[PDB]
Design a protein around this nucleic acid. Structure first.
Ligand SMILES: O=C(NC[C@H]1CN(c2ccc(N3CCOCC3)c(F)c2)C(=O)O1)C(Cl)Cl
Length: 77
RNA sequence: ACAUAGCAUAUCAGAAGGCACACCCGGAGAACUGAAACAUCUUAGUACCCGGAGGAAGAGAAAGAAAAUUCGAUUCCCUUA
RNA sequence: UACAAGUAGUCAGAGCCCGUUAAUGGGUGAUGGCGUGCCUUUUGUAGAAUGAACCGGCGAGUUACGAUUUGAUGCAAGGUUAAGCAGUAAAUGUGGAGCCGUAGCGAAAGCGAGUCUGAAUAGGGCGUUUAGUAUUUGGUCGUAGACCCGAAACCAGGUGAUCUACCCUUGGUCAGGUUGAAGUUCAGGACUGAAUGGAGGACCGAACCGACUUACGUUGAAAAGUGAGCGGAUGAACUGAGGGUAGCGGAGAAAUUCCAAUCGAACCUGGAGAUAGCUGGUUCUCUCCGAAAUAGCUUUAGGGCUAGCCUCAAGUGAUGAUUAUUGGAGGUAGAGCACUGUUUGGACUUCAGACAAACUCCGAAUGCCAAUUAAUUUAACUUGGGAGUCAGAACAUGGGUGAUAAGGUCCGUGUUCGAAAGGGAAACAGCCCAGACCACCAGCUAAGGUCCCAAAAUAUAUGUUAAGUGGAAAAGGAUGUGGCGUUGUGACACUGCGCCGAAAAUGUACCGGGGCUAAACAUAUUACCGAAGCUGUGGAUUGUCCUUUGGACAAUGGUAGGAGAGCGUUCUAAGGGCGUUGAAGCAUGAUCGUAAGGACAUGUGGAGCGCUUAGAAGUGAGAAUGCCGGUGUGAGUAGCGAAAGACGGGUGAGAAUCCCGUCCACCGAUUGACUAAGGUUUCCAGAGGAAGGCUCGUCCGCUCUGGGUUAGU
RNA sequence: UAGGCCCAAGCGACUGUUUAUCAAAAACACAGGUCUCUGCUAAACCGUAAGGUGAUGUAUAGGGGCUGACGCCUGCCCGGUGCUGGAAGGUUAAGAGGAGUGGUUAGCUUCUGCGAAGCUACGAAUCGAAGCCCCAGUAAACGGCGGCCGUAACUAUAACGGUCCUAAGGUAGCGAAAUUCCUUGUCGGGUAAGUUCCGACCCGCACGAAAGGCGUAACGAUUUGGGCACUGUCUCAACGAGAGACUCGGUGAAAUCAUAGUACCUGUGAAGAUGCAGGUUACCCGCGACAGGACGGAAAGACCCCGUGGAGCUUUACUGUAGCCUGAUAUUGAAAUUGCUUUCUAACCCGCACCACUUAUCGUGGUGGGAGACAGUGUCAGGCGGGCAGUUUGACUGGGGCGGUCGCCUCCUAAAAGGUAACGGAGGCGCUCAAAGGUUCCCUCAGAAUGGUCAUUCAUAGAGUGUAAAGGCAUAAGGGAGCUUGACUGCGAGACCUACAAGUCGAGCAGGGUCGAAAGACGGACUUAGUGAUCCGGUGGUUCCGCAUGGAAGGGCCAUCGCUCAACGGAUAAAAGCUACCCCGGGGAUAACAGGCUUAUCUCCCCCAAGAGUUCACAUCGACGGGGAGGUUUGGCACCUCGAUGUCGGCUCAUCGCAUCCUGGGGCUGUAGUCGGUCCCAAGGGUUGGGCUGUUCGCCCAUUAAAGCGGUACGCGAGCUGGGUUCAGAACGUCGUGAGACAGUUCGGUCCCUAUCCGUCGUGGGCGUAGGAAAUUUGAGAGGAGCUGUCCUU
RNA sequence: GUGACUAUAGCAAGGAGGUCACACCUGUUCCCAUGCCGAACACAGAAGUUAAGCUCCUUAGCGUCGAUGGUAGUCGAACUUACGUUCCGCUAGAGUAGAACGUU
């Protein structure tokens, strides 16, 4: 009567890692993701795996890109 | 054949057995155990057992130790650790 | 104290009797309220889970050496000795070999306040902290049995065949009867018949040896028997004596059967205190704090290790929390069909309508992350020493699974129990209220209630219900009844409360009981009762602020566990004391302390003990189916071991039982006579009656005191 | 005092033997049969050896394996595997051999290179037996003996055919059997009644020829069925005798025991209360008796599970071993002929003869004979070797076994941050690319409508993206083309994740470059799977070390390689099973019974009413659907009990519910009467005796007014039995290589207790009831009884 | 021309605009190019033409934004098995914006 289910993956902690309006140091991770759910703004860059990191230590502010898309910019403190 | 096995007399405080469930030196020599199982390994060359001593026993007089400008049998104690 | 329902106490309390360490006295206790022992183990025990009959004594984290951290002390870029020698088994002197430290980095060569990687201080890792060290107090860990008790087992060296298995050597026993093979002998004619013969793991059947059935016994007469029957009973029989085979072995007509009441591998001593991730137990008091039942890995799943949650010390120092505000990320509930599927009815792609955990054109409530924002509060982190936890439960709620079963099972969030007493739910860990420092015969409230049991309203205003509905349950039925609205005295939609549907087993038995027509319901007013909550008073310990070192405020449930302060016992040193005009101890007492406990007085006792301050421990017992001793209960109970005794006469302190006599009874292939093994004086006579004899005893196989065994065969 | 007999059947031929103490048998032995080894220092066995037994025997003898008198027989196959035999080959050890490399250094003389002899670290080709591969044989060696269809001179059936497979397809006999699940097979016999028995048939799940087949006179403390006789076994009990019991005198235990002033009921509770709640009942003390409760007492559950617990047994589990065979070599000599061969004598050997020690089957010596460099013995090597030994034989798990799974990736569950479980719902991975990477430029899809791959309009977007799924992408991350190797070297501020080890991202910096005119981009692929600690071994470099010194051997560092170590944090280089012969430590953390919750299943009741019932839905019946009750069955959960809660069915005794079988009272009928059907009230009483089966249920027989259904631990084992059920023996079929297991089936098999409390049944005493008595009573309350037939009359 | 901007910008319909700017338009002579095609790409250029593009103005047919009010849904609380209070407040749908704001 045995079944052929019962196996999942490992959950990979995947989501926003800094809050809008927080002071970040210049290499912190800002958002992890599969494919661009949010885009790299100004002073921010995406690497392989598309994770968003801040190049320079400033403030992080989530913004809008058109009607649908979004973006993560890092102003200067 | 010579002879040598035997055989029979004689001498000998020769030997024998015990004993301290202590010590020591050889012969032979487990297992439970630890390895969180188990076999190499460990317990352990331990327990028991057998033989020989002796008041001690064994070791002992460099075919050694070392690497300085050397020491000079063995045993044992502290360290090296 | 003989009308009463009892974890045997506790609070209140008359009545009766006494009279102390003399102080809100002691003993008893009609009666009323409350109240289901203690440990252990558990999610959870009154538990019908464990364990303890009771009393007394004994009985469980210790020591040696190392490491680590903490307190104290001594010195300080230094600290310090080890063996040895001297010394009273002592300090102590001496003994600088050795160790730690002031310098680190690298695998290393080797550099050095730097170094390694590197082509490159480029960057980066590790250093430049600039005080260590020695001894000792405590915590903890390591190696030794290492908190105590407890295996089944394994190995080595011996002791066992007097039982039982098999064999060997030499002996013995089997009442009686029945049948009638071969063989032979005769008469015949190879074979027949009659005599004879006495064969047989033959037949019947005692001893003998077994053990089929069945009853009895099962704290037995007996650790395998007795009664009645039953089988072999000249043989593969039974049996005595002397011998032999021995445990990694031996014997087996073979059953895992026997090897000294024990055998899938004997018994004894040693390794040995084997090991036990398992059960059980683990001894004095108080004060403060106070969990977990989770993640990960695991030859792992009732174990362990790191992390999460607790505790103590030091430090940093606002970094903690709830709220307000703003910003944000994210796709749930909801909803919708634009995507992917599913789908109804038409029209002929399209109108209208539906479904979705793995659909989304959309999209909350909450929760989450922030600011360096404000407001109330006072935690938070780090580095250290120490742990415990890894079996969780119910309740509400969001889901999976199951069957929109389960006091089911698995996860998110919360609460309580765990570890939490008090009030309500009748009783009832988890439900509602509420967190016990202690005393009080004071007050206010909380859930919940106010007819009586049972504290407080037979309150108040307005209505509903007649079923005892209240005070267990549906589909469906139906001129029950009230409200309200729409309708042509009839008909309707919504509704309030009721009826039927409605059957279970010891006893009413689905309000806790009486009882209730209001003491049930719906809405609103008051009053009051009601807890260990809060308040008032007094008290006790911790704290922090100094109004005035005074007060003032705050805290004080607790299991695993962490920390502190103490009591008591034996001994030791020093000091100072008591004591034959009475020590220790024991008995009684109405005494002082917050507890462990400390005094005092009187009896008993007869010769040693306190007290202060330190030191050292075989330092505290209610639990181990703990060990040893005593003593209960069961209880005047079961039993008193196969069977015929009676009377007379004695002896006697005492006679169912001892002696003598008469009668009677039982055995008689034996209950008689004799001997081997074995026992080893039990044999006889005089005396005895403490213990033994399953009762008694004047008796004896018992006790005391003297005697008894004679060999050339 | 002293045989019951007869008719049949299964097993075993017979007498015998067996589990001391739960099994006496169908088990063992057996006389007989057959296979096999053994030439005598026999084989086999004991002991390390000497030495023995075998046997003071010798192939008509000795050991071992199977079967089991007697009679008739004993069929077939040699794949595989065991055994005997053969030696062509293939393969294989020590030992022989020593081409040949490396180390060192005299010397060379370059300057890291050459290299004598030695000493030394390793070696190659060749020679090296037995074994294994290979070739045959063997079946009273181990074992094993098929399917699927069609078809008349046998109605349906299949003598006969077609096909595939192999070692070979089960012969003679027997057959629902100690073997048959279905199944109490079908038939006949026996009985009034036959799950047993007998006789047959044959769909032989799953008979069958020496683990023998079939049959058999005699024998059996064997198993089974049936008669005659006989009976207290029984209907259905009665009385008498003795012992215990009871009362008296004497003596006088024991297990047990937290303290007890110890009631019932309905509840509640760790879900089965003397002790809690609420009610109901009970004056204080005994004595005799019974056995419902104290989850009564003994025995730290023999069942079940768990110990990384033991023990015994098995095997083609792992690693070993006593032994046995085979080679080189030492003891170990000569001759011939070519290391294989053959001859000789002195080594060695003689359980050979004689002689002497010696008025000894020991031994020693001497002499002959035989054997002879072999044997035996020592060291070394190979092989066989459950004969024996030490051990391993996973976990999760709605108990365990069987089934499945175990590591990584993507979804949903997942409750809009992240994380989040189940043996919840779906899938994938253990790679692939030298261009499917980088860069630079250009380009835009899928499908329809149109016409006959092509052309155009329409076409956010439905394609493609290597590969799952999700998230993204028309900045293109999709397509095409040029150029190249960044699929770089040393690193890395900071961050996410995180128990640890790991994992992921990363600006920027230096060395070197590729593309581009340049800014710039580039440390693989649109993102996320495609992987495995350490230890050890190998290889390439190197700066390090190299035990007096110089080299080297060997190490270290850097770079790579070797793990379905897939049980994927990997226990070792190396590992399966049974126990019903079992053993210890634990658990109600976890099963079997009973209890508890649930009600899927079960029993019953109802709603709607399409219909059937001559028309008529509702006398009776009730499709498709719907809603309940109960707590008897089959289950689910796993809450109490594993320091013990004893099973099914009968016997004794009952008691309760009502969902009524009979008797009592009614309604409606498709009720003429008798007789019925279906509802309704009713629990007072009653509710049979046999056959078969362990049986309950179930069928049958003969009656009756009727032959009720349920609860009470499927009531009751301190009241009884012990037939079945799961103890140890033995056997059948089947499975297993095996030890052994059941789907099974069959024959045999120790049932302990002296009653303390409550409870019940009897029977006394103390006090009470306002003086002490005797007698007669009322009766609150409680208990008993309560059934029915058939005849005649109307 | 070139940036910002959440389609309120778009899709659509009409109608109007010529070389002074924007194209279409003329050809391969080279620069460069088509897996064929001076189609595109790009080079030399004036003619002929707004027809088309483009831009400017008008239309609310689709597209998009979208209030209010109520409802669903819940945070929390209190009786209890799903109603009652208080706050937050949707989707859908009707009223509406709307034929683009805007730098250098
Ligand atoms: O001691 C013993 N049991 C102690 C406990 C357990 N139990 C008990 C009762 C009945 C059974 N059944 C019924 C059906 O399943 C098999 C047999 C059972 F398995 C155990 C009981 O009542 O008490 C036995 Cl060994 Cl005598």
């Amino acid at each position: 009567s045995s079944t052929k289910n019962g196996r999942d993956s490992e959950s990979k902690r995947l989501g926003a890692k800094r809050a809008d309006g927080q002071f970040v140091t210049g290499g912190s991770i800002l958002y992890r993701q599969r494919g661009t759910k949010i885009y790299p703004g100004e002073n921010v860059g995406r690497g392989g795996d598309d994770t968003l990191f801040a190049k320079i230590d400033g403030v992080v502010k989530f913004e809008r890109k058109g009607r649908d898309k979004k973006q993560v910019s890092v102003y200067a403190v």
